[PDB]
């Protein structure tokens, strides 16, 4: 049974609620981004409208095989009417094609649903600037002050350097990057670009990347592994036994892997900076964890919400326990009292 925080009052609209069957009264199904928790349930057998970004559109048609008619792509940053309701999609700064949705209700209420987002000062100069938001459906993934991590540009710096170093010391070394969804494409594209290479991947992952409207993408990626010195692998495969195995397959063409596991937060964020990172090392395979986040840190979230001064906040993440629910409300109260809304 679809939860109340996946429904939008005074509409027949739902958001990311594709796993319950037909939600009675729902005329329209919004999908914020192509990640399997959010899309869980979609198939070729959907015959209700789906509204989403062009990019999320391409992924629905091409990866899940939804029929072109039922995908309604909308441009971003454009006042659009949908069943006589003004909506806007805004870039969520999450993974490719991810959006936040502004709902302008008939009664005069304005609601922002963030989806998954990494809050940023650039969003304060968007269309949000123009008017008051009464309700905020918030990605609370990292709503706890422990949750700090560096900026994406910081991480991309570290990564580029590490890789370019090792490759220039040993030109028969291979870069590997772990991956299991869309998101975090800048890690492998920035490396591949510093190294004079295309990125090489399985057929499935090439098909996934070809839907994302990346500029010049045909010059950046290949399905010919042999020709590439940056490879992608299933994140499941980024370990010693798995990297050993894969190092066999390349057939005496490289003598050292240098891998990256872009993760989110882990407990080593609490005690070690990004400029002081190390890898594990079982012989010639050296795995780096790097905390490249596509979710708001505590402070980023805090800033966004205190600028937005929403009259009410509704969490979409970590809502499954009363302890997390309670904990999160305390933070919302502090922000409000600090800020004087
Ligand atoms: Ni996500």
Curated annotation (Swiss-Prot):
<comment type="subunit">
    <text>Binds constitutively to TP53BP1. Binds CDC27, which is itself a component of the anaphase promoting complex (APC). Binds PIAS1.</text>
</comment>
<protein>
    <recommendedName>
        <fullName>DNA cross-link repair 1A protein</fullName>
    </recommendedName>
</protein>
<comment type="function">
    <text>May be required for DNA interstrand cross-link repair. Also required for checkpoint mediated cell cycle arrest in early prophase in response to mitotic spindle poisons. Possesses beta-lactamase activity, catalyzing the hydrolysis of penicillin G and nitrocefin. Exhibits no activity towards other beta-lactam antibiotic classes including cephalosporins (cefotaxime) and carbapenems (imipenem).</text>
</comment>
<comment type="similarity">
    <text>Belongs to the DNA repair metallo-beta-lactamase (DRMBL) family.</text>
</comment>
